[PDB]
Design a protein around this ligand. Sequence first.
Ligand SMILES: N[C@@H](Cc1cc(-c2ccc(Cl)cc2Cl)cc(CP(=O)(O)O)c1O)C(=O)O
Ligand SMILES: *[C@@H]1O[C@H](CO)[C@@H](O)[C@H](O)[C@H]1NC(C)=O
Lengths: 79, 238, 101, 152, 286, 147
Amino acid sequence: WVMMFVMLLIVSAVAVFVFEYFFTIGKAIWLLWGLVFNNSVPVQNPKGTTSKIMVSVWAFFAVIFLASYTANLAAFMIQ
Amino acid sequence: LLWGLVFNNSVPVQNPKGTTSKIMVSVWAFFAVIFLASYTANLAAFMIQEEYVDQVSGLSDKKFQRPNDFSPPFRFGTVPNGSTERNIRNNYAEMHAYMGKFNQRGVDDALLSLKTGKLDAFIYDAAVLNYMAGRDEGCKLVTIGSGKVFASTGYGIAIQKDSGWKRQVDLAILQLFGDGEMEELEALWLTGICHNEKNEVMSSQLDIDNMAGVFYMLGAAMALSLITFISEHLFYWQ
Amino acid sequence: ICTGPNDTSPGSPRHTVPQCCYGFCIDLLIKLARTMQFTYEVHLVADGKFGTQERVQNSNKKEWNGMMGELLSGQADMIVAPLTINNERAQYIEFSKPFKY
Amino acid sequence: SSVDIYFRRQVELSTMYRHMEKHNYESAAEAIQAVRDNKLHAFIWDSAVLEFEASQKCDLVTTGELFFRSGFGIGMRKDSPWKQQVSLSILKSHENGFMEDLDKTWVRYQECDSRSNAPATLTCENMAGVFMLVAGGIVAGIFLIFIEIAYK
Amino acid sequence: QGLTILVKKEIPRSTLDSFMQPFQSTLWLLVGLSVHVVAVMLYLLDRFSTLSSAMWFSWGVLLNSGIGEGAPRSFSARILGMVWAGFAMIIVASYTANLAAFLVLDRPEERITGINDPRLRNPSDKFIYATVKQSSVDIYFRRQVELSTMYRHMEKHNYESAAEAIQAVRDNKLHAFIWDSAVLEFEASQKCDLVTTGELFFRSGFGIGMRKDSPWKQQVSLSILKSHENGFMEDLDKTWVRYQECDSRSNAPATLTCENMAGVFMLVAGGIVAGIFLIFIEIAYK
Amino acid sequence: EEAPFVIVESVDPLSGTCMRNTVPCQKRIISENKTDEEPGYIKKCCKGFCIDILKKISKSVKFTYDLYLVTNGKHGKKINGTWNGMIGEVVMKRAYMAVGSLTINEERSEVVDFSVPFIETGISVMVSRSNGTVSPSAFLEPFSACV
Ligand SMILES: N[C@@H](Cc1cc(-c2ccc(Cl)cc2Cl)cc(CP(=O)(O)O)c1O)C(=O)O
Ligand SMILES: *[C@@H]1O[C@H](CO)[C@@H](O)[C@H](O)[C@H]1NC(C)=O
């Protein structure tokens, strides 16, 4: 529940400072937070065809994480 | 736009203007977020199934009379040199000989060959199997239902012929049947653990045989797409 | 040629009319006949019951019903039909070995 | 029949019998048509006569557990000259394979089979709420449209 | 009082290897190919009537990420992309559904349902249960006959005193224990990693012992009955037993933890790595 | 006692009997009879499923009995027109009845006479249990055609 947040911060920092190599300094945390929970709002999302892959890896992680949550929670609802 | 909204966010869309339409669309979106939930939910019920034992008839079915349609696994086995074979050897002589490559030893060396995939089925006396079915804990090994036994005989008491004792022991045994005692001995002695019902086993990984249906529809859509590309391309006279 | 009495359900005048029957038992019966050289006739029970003991006359006299009573009264000779095997009938009748468990 | 003979002279089933006496029928041909009409909820009889039902029709099904054990038989008056020959000819018909032939010819059709009654897919009559709400959304639009033109 | 069984209350801990568990290791490959398949096939049906863009769109409808901006402009390509989106929904729906189905049925074990449990009627070396030697329990089992095999099993393990059997259950050297209920119940309350299996057994009642025909018998057996209506034994009860310090209810369904979700964090780390490689290749291609 | 139908348990010296739903049974065993060594001794103490049938029948029809094991030829298998074992012992009048595992068939219904069968038996098949699978069309279950 907090390893998520720490990975969040790390990936955001490395994402922007990888993007530097070929407007996007803190808008990251916005974007990634939205991606983890669900689509919230337009975002000036990337450039930097490398970053266009880091973000997709994160999105995959999110689509698995939400599934795990929704799934296991369906067990705690039978008492 | 609406298709995307029903399944899930796909692509940018020049979505509305018209502050009224900016509300119709939201109503649709709400409907979608409820519809997907209902689907994902109810589908989680169809994924808990029960064990499955085949509905095979007696020795008379195709699976032994014509044991060459599905050639690989037909492995009707037995135990050698005994009363079991002779009845087979006198009604299904060909189907007796076929079994020649399946002679086990004892009965345990045969019950094991059904947990290590060496054999298909097994033929032996009923009342000893039944008690032997209630022995193993791995209930993945359980005989077929009764009413399918081949040569229905019983167990009896041997009396010197012409004696007068016969009538009385008969009436006595029918008595024991009459007042439920027989079930008491039967339950204390023969019927063991494995009078249970098939479990709700969680599936293993979904596999391609299971999920083939979606792929066939994917391919059919590919073909229909090709067909529309062809039909439109007929427009070279206008 | 099943010689049945039950043209109509009980509770109405019976006009015993010929019928014809078949199935498991008739085939078994024909096999037995070929084995032991009989000539048979068949007539359905006039009771439509299997048969059991019961007090009568507001008394303690014990009489049977249906086909079992039709045998013990000599009215019949053999019950070739789906009849069970129990102790209470075994004290007036002779049961073959069982042919269906 | 034999079932009431079994229940009467049993004691642990005193209350059971005391209940049944009020409803017992005339012949299984009536009890089956009375179960398939929901005038009854159960029925007890000889297995080999029920199993032929679960196979011919397939909206009825049995509950497996095998009860008091017996075996059908033939009836002859006590001490008849025919007894021994008959009871022999039977045993012949259980190794030559004759009774199996009769069996297969007459019983054991398995025309209908049951397995894992489905978890009852949804249908048109309970999802009716959401379609009602989207219709009602259509309606309200035709009202709140003009209010725009007014506010213009 | 009566007799009951005292087993160890297992701590629930969900079994799960990694996120791949709901998919046969082939299916991952099958989708990992079919994505590119549809990508390429889409790239054509717009030229013959944007390649990187088509690949993004394809491999990004499935991932639910908004990345990727193009869109099929044909008629045919639109008709494809729609059902591509649909199939992508089906995939995730099925994955999370089957995961849910597995996570429900993953429940730890089954407590012994009493003495009628067949798990006790049959002896196995993988299940040991004992009592104290030379007591009333062995007197009950010996002169019983239906428990012939039961007794025949126990004779090999019976202990010296419950003070040893309890410390032997809490060490997993044993799997059960049978004794006087009112002596076990004080255990399930003081400690709370052990719990009993409810069903009340052979019934008895404690008593005092005096040699036969002693002058003290009647007065003693009277003074007892006085202490059951004035309310004295209740006071002794409450003073010494009935603490209920620990209670059990509906052992939890074993929340996930850090040691089985380790797959996804491994994959995101590995994603971090591969980036530091495939970055320079860009600078090269520039 | 070639079955889990009747069991022999070696004699107990802890008491001298069994007495717990059991019954004694002899075995006039002869072996290495090259020196005319007189045979016989009390072998194990008997108990089992058919034994209980035996006891209850005996108390219901009021006789008494004398249980003893066979020597050779476990069941009846004719050899050279002679019966050996549990069926000889009935045809040579060295016994009156024989209980235990003993089926029924024409080949025996001329030498000895038979009681009413108290178990079903015969030839039947064993199979293994197939795990639960998913239809290739599961993903269309959860919605009736209309919706
Ligand atoms: N009951 C038969 C003899 C007979 C007995 C057994 C048998 C042996 C051990 C056990 Cl523990 C259980 C059983 Cl049932 C098996 C068969 C069958 P087969 O020997 O061909 O394998 C048989 O014929 C009779 O009355 O002679
Ligand atoms: C069924 O699943 C169980 C799960 O443990 C496995 O042990 C067994 O081998 C499986 N049987 C078959 C036929 O796949």
